[PDB]
């Protein structure tokens, strides 16, 4: 349907998959990384009804489905379900055949090896894609943001990777990776709202809480002052409409959940928080690198859309940083949608045509080729 | 010798072309039944010989 064998770009995370073609500005479609399955016995006959549902089908029919995510903390653990998600992504909504297009997939630099290897195998064996590449999330964010140097703090649904990059090169000894993510904030919000009389323990309830989080929650610039008021007055509560007509209001819980990014102890995690790890990613780099990383804190990934987060991340690191020097945050309206955007940019670069793995080299090496050719 | 190389290549390609046709035929057969099931979904409530004996008896 395209006038060129443009690469397909699929930003497959632990949240939603954003997909479209290289050279465009935006994904053609977005899909929950979900395969749904009925938890009930059918009663009426000739009702259609699938054994399993994919993406938005799984979410739309969720009233009686248990919903599973094949990707956890950035890694595919269930590749049969990813084959279904990709079939849907490519043939039902983008309506393209990867057999005629190179495909670009994304991951964090320390994502366990099985992820990129199984992603490579699925696209070469079930879709028979002519070429593959698995790209770095930080690289993709840097292209989207217009930078070659900076800290990419990618606090999304799966993991926070936090990798410093200078002149387009990794500074791997300074990756302050953290097992704290948007999915934990969602789990925390389900629990804290349960305490308000609105229990959220089932799949339908979990999807509702994620929707509540995305629309009602924030981190603010000053937690203690924000809570001093939110805990004292109803003036800071915000309502939300649930699908069945219930109305829930959230007070200080509205920010106490999200605050776990700065205070991980709220969910039992042992961590300094995302702002200290951002600071250390800069500090652990050489002294002639530090000045450029301080001036370029690059925000990407999920959770970047919480009110007060860009302002707060700059405040928290500038407060740890030395005086005289200027410390700055980069947080464009392209935040979180930067990995997909970077995929489009990267896939299309003329210099990247030497990075793509072809369905030639693949057959001689097998999927393990991804560890020889990508990064 | 060129012809032998050409016939060998053409049948390799031919197999894939025939397989591609087969795949689209298969999709039509599958789509057709889904449509038939949906047709039954709305036609079913009236597929009866009705209201004759009601007056005859």
């Amino acid at each position: 349907d395209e006038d060129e064998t443009t690469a397909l770009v699929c930003d497959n995370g632990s949240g939603l998959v954003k997909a479209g073609f290289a050279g465009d500005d935006a994904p053609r479609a977005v899909f929950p990384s979900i395969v749904g399955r009925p938890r009930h016995q059918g009663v009426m006959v000739g009702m259609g009804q699938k054994d399993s549902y994919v993406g938005d089908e799984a979410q739309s029919k969720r009233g009686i489905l248990t919903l599973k995510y094949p990707i956890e903390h950035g890694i595919i653990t269930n590749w049969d379900d990813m084959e279904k998600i990709w079939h849907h992504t490519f043939y039902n909504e983008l309506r393209v055949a990867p057999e005629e297009h190179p495909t670009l997939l994304t991951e964090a630099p320390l994502n366990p090896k099985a992820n990129r290897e199984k992603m490579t195998q699925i696209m070469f064996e079930t879709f028979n894609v002519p070429a593959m590449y698995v790209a770095i999330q930080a690289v993709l964010s840097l292209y989207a943001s217009g930078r070659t140097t900076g800290i990419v703090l990618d606090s999304g649904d799966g993991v926070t990777h936090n990798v410093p990059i200078y002149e387009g090169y990794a500074l791997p000894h300074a990756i302050m990776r953290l097992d704290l993510a948007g999915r934990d904030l969602t789990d925390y919000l389900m629990k804290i709202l349960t305490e308000r009389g609105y229990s959220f323990v089932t799949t339908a309830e979990r999807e509702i809480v994620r929707d509540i989080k995305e629309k009602l929650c924030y981190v603010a610039l000053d937690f203690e002052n924000e809570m001093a008021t939110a805990a004292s007055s109803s003036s800071l509560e915000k309502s939300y409409e649930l699908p069945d007509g219930q109305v829930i209001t959230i007070g200080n819980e509205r920010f106490r959940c999200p605050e776990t990014l700065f205070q991980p102890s709220f969910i039992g995690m042992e961590s300094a928080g995302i702002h200290e790890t951002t600071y250390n990613s800069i500090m652990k780099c050489d002294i002639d690198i530090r000045k450029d990383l301080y001036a370029n804190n690059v925000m990407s990934g999920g959770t970047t859309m919480y009110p007060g987060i860009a302002d707060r991340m700059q405040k928290e690191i500038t407060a740890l940083a030395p005086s005289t020097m200027k410390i700055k945050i980069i947080a464009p309206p392209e935040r979180k949608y930067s990995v997909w955007i970077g995929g489009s940019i990267l896939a299309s670069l003329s210099t990247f045509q030497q990075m793509w793995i072809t369905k030639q080299e693949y057959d001689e090496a097998g999927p393990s080729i991804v560890h020889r050719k990508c990064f | 010798r060129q012809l032998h190389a050409r016939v060998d290549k053409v049948d390799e390609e031919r197999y894939d072309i025939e397989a591609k046709v087969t795949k689209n035929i298969t999709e039509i057969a599958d789509l057709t039944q889904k449509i038939f099931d949906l047709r039954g979904k709305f036609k079913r409530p009236t597929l009866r010989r009705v209201r004759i004996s009601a007056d005859a008896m």
Binding site: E125, T126, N128 | D11, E12, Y15, D16, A19
Partner: peptide, 14 residues
Amino acid sequence: QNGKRQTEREKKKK
């Protein structure tokens, strides 16, 4: 001290 592609590859070649 004491693959789906292999199947299709074979079909077209056979």
